[PDB]
Design a protein around this nucleic acid. Sequence first.
RNA 1: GCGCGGAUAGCUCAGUCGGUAGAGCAGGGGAUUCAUAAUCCCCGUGUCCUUGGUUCGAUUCCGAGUCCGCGCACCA
RNA 2: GUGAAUGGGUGCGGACAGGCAUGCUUCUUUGCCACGACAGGAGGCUGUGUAACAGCAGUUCUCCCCGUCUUCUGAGCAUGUU
RNA 3: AUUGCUCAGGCAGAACAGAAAUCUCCCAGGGAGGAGAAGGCCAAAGGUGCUGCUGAUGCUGCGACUCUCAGUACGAGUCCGAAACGUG
RNA 4: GCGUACGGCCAUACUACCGGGAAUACACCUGAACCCGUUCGAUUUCAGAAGUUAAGCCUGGUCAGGCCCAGUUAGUACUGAGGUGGGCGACCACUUGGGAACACUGGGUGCUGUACGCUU
Lengths: 54, 158, 260, 178, 91
Amino acid sequence: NNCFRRVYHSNWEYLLSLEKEADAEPKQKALRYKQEKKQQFREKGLKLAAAKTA
Amino acid sequence: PHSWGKKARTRDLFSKGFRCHGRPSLSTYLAVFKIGDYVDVVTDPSVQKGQPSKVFQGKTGTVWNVTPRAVGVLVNKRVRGRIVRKKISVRTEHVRKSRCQQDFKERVRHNELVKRTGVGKKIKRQPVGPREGQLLKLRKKPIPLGAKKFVFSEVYNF
Amino acid sequence: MFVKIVKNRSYFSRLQIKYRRRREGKTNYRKRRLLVAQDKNKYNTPKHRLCVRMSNKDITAQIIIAKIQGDVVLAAAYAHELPIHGAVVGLTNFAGAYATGLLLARRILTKLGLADKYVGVAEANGEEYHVEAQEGRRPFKAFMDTGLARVTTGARIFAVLKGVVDGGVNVPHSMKRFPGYNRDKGEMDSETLRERIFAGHVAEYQKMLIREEPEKYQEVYSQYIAKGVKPGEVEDMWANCHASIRANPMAKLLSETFEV
Amino acid sequence: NKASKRLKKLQNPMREIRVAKLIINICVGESGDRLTRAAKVVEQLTGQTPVLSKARLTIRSFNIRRNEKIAVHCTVRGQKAEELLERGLKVKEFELKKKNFSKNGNFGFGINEHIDLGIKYDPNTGIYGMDFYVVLERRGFRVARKKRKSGKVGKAHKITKKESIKWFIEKFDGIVTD
Amino acid sequence: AKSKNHTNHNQNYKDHRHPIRLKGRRNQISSKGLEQKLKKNRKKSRKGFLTPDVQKEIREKRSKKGEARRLKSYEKFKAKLPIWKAKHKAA
RNA sequence: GCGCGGAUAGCUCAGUCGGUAGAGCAGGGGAUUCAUAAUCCCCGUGUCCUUGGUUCGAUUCCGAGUCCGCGCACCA
RNA sequence: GUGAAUGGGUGCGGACAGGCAUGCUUCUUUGCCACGACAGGAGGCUGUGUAACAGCAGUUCUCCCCGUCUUCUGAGCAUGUU
RNA sequence: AUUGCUCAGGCAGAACAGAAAUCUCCCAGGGAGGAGAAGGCCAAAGGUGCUGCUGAUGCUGCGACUCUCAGUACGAGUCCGAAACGUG
RNA sequence: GCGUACGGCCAUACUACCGGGAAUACACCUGAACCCGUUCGAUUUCAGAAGUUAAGCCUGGUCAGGCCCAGUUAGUACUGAGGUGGGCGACCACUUGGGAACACUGGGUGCUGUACGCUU
């Protein structure tokens, strides 16, 4: 649909999900910090692989 | 139209929806805008203050200024051969958080979580392309398709 | 001659319906918009409101944060959980409303960590206490929400408000709606407000009804007599409940407060 | 036992009809000479200061302007309401007519001279006719009258012309005309 | 005498001869109009800004804070690692 | 086609910038007169062309259509 | 009360994206002390390579948990890192 | 500005009183009202009673804007900062 | 399986009629010394707890009215692009794309968040 009702409902669901995002954003920030730690680890493992193969 | 008022030719434009009258709810007021946010400038006729001009009715702008009850938005407007960056100071009843970047942000978060955790396949979003060859066993027997006889009654039913 | 039916199919088809909580007679949406609408400069900084509601047999107070999913409730306090603090009878009094407000204030200040910093007033006066700030965290600020109740000079809504103000919550308030206040002159009567806080009106009425008319005192006030309460111990009962609340705010059982 | 339970339901105690209010109304059509005396006599009948009603629309046929005070009235509730209702029904000899009852149950009756109501002095104000309108209720009717969490009375609890007539028959021991 | 006044005929053509662009798209927009509290706060913030060397040593100190715990636990794990590797061998 | 004015009791005219209306004559009753007229004492007579906001009320306010009359209609 | 076709605004990323740590503020917040004090355990864990996950490397490792001490408001602007 | 209330119209009822005076009950999404043209908007209300007020020029040689537009002015209007106030 | 307080979306939630409701409640309910407000303690304020689920509220039913959903209307109407297509025109067909609406048929008749409880 494209009704005013449908569009307003989609906007209300958008605002709901933005609220839930902000509500679980601290937990997400912890998870994302750990993910950057793992990305650091992956990068340095690749660097060690290259330096040992060279 | 020999009358260029601030609300000229807005009978259908600033009309509410069928069974949609009333001032906006608390979801309109609990929204949160930051500078740089994308927002649809969508006038709410139930609030006669802070309204934008009718020339920014379906325009998506970006937030440049946040005041107590209103928000500043930068909307591009083609004048004749230019584009000008109109600055509107519109209350937050006549503006909505624009989902114009929702798919892009979903895709970016997906690809970044992929390249951070090692799961997923990093959307690239190609079009819908041609299909390959199939062999299509398909028990179903074909239905005879063809033109049919003309019947004046079955056309001009009464 | 019949009546032209007005609740037509077209009437029902084109009729728009009120909001649900307004049909229920429960939410004042104009006051709701005005109170909860937060300055857009405070990005997702909610307005905490002391929503106070009253029923025939209970008085509820809540610190509420309005969100789009729903309202988030912090440190509620009901006038039926005063018995676990030693307020057995006369709940929903002006005394009971003040007591439940003070309980709420203590509970929210504990939950926040400001209970040992902002104490308010312990010996309940009748005068004006405005929570003075200190060096670190400012006192909790909440905004009064009366809802559909009628505000009058001497209402239990404002009994609860005075309770939380004394308990230490920085609710903005004037005294213009308190039992002592005189609208004509523009001045409070701290002694009559204190007497109403400690239920001196109920105790004096009970002494009057024991002096004269010793049958209405059993018609009304029957469970005042069923319990071990007497006109003359009501004030110090409420004083002891105030002390007990301030001692153990987040108490739910009688083992916390008594049996020591 | 459906019949037993429903008979007991309708014989609940909270279904006892009371007198919500009694309205004493005197529409004179004049603007201060007879109206002050109408106010005084209605405040002698009732025990509270009356309220003065003004004319909606200037009607050059009844000699009434707009906002011009033309009537006076009072709402009594409770003990004095029952007493004054008894007085009016005594004036009418406790008989009444079916048309005097509304579709919602409330009833009314007008009297021509008020001295018979037990008022002593006639000529200081003058004989005044008036309308006694009695509005009935059961205890429970405030759900429509309050503001917060208000509903509206259910069809079983609403009073009808039939039971209003029969209640006015039993209490006051009277007659109802065709 | 009597003219044919208004027309919008060749206007899109003239308007599209050269590309319809915004003049300054990457340029910053002035701070004039921005809310006064935010402008004052930007000014005072920048006034209070520390220097990059002080910031570098601050971040260094913050990193060194939990070091005695981290290095110890990490070396313990690194010591227990070869046992894990030799167990994973037996698979 | 243009611009304007007007429709008020049987006749002729007032009242036309919002709190129901008049003047003269007329008509009906009484009187004077032998009788009529004049004269005296009285009386009734008008949804103010017809249609709509109507400020609470409109002859009296605006808005169309009827009916009557007026003026303009040049260089062509 | 519905509502096209054709249209209009916006968005579709660096190799400036995205993430992470930290700073400052007289602005905001109840949200400061704190750029502070204290701190245990479990662990074939983590990464590259693979549907055979074997193999290979060890980087202030992974999880309880970005812990506890009443428990740590945001926003804007910057400093670094990737 | 607080605050209480709900409008047009209608059924039914009450002495004079009737079609139309005033009173009572039920129904009523707005068919009312908001000065006026039309349109939009609005129901525990941008209606209305009562009351309190004067924010009917937010101190300046005081801002960014929007409609108009040449992206000029006047005008009109939106949004802010903070003095002093009204109401609560 | 529910109650209350505050809500979000604002009829699958409303309107009418017929029934049922354990507990906590909520509610009706009782009085006027005080605070307070009224022409009237009706509203309202205060103070209570004798009674009742009668009503409010919740809940079950209705080929109820409404509302919602799916099908269907219907590739119908309309329509962007194209033709040295037809037709005197009115307008219609074709090529290449897009594609409804009412009606009709039938089904359904709130979901849920935070807190405090009941049910244990």
